[PDB]
Amino acid sequence: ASTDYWQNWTDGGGIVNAVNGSGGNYSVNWSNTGNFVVGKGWTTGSPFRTINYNAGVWAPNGNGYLTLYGWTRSPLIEYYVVDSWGTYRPTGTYKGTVKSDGGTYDIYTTTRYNAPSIDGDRTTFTQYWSVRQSKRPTGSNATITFTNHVNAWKSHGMNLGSNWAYQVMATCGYQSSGSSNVTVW
């Protein structure tokens, strides 16, 4: 499918050279950053969407995630489906596991306090995570069957909000450097 949303957010720290390429393609070169999220996807997320991507380059030198990323409002929730990472594997409060698209993911919940959100300003919100147990190899056509994650989260009392915001296949980083090139469809 054609992507219709371009996400390019940085808190202003360091260098974040994000390129909005042709179709669903984008690349990022980052150096000595603060927090940032770059990615392509859809303006309105869906719990039924099947996301396809191919990360031609996934080369983080530090803390960075290659992850499905999105938000819902009512309640405000930031969610992730992490396929690969750099030096740090994100974890939180363990809820259980889900097998999807050839991999096994651990399910975690964390909370952010006085942090930036899609609404602007700062607030406290919950984060839902599905983190692969082992890094998924990159360079190949990968699929994330999002429904499997949504259903598993629900079975663990992790309900998403009623108002869906954007949903993208992103490159997130925190105080690191690196490069990525990803195509989303």
Ligand X SMILES: O[C@@H]1[C@@H](O)[C@H](O[C@@H]2CO[C@@H](O)[C@H](O)[C@H]2O)OC[C@H]1O
Residues that bind ligand X (CB under 6 A): 9, 35, 37, 78, 112, 115-118, 172
Q: 173-182 burial by CB neighbour count: b if 16+ within 10 A, else e?
A: bbebbbbbbb
- The distance of closest approach from Cβ of residue 158 to ligand X in the complex, given in angstroms and rounded to an integer, is 17
Q: Which is nearer to ligand X, 112 or 156 (CB)?
A: 112
How far is the C-alpha of 180 from the C-alpha of 175, rounded, in Å? 16
**Residue pointed to by tokens 């290659």:** 66
Q: Which is nearer to ligand X, 17 or 140 (CB)?
A: 17
Q: Which is nearer to ligand X, 122 or 154 (CB)?
A: 122
CA gyration radius for the chain? 15
Residue nearest to ligand X (CB): 116
Q: Which is nearer to ligand X, 102 or 120 (CB)?
A: 120
- The distance of closest approach from Cβ of residue 140 to ligand X in the complex, given in angstroms and rounded to an integer, is 26
How far is the C-alpha of 171 from the C-alpha of 38, rounded, in Å? 5
Phi-psi region of 62 (alpha: psi -120 to 50; beta: other; left: phi over 0): left
- The distance of closest approach from Cβ of residue 172 to ligand X in the complex, given in angstroms and rounded to an integer, is 6
Q: Tokens for 40, please give them.
A: 């392509």
Q: Which of 179, 173, 182 is nearest to 87 (CA)?
A: 173
Q: Which is nearer to ligand X, 104 or 111 (CB)?
A: 111
- The distance of closest approach from Cβ of residue 139 to ligand X in the complex, given in angstroms and rounded to an integer, is 25
- The distance of closest approach from Cβ of residue 40 to ligand X in the complex, given in angstroms and rounded to an integer, is 14
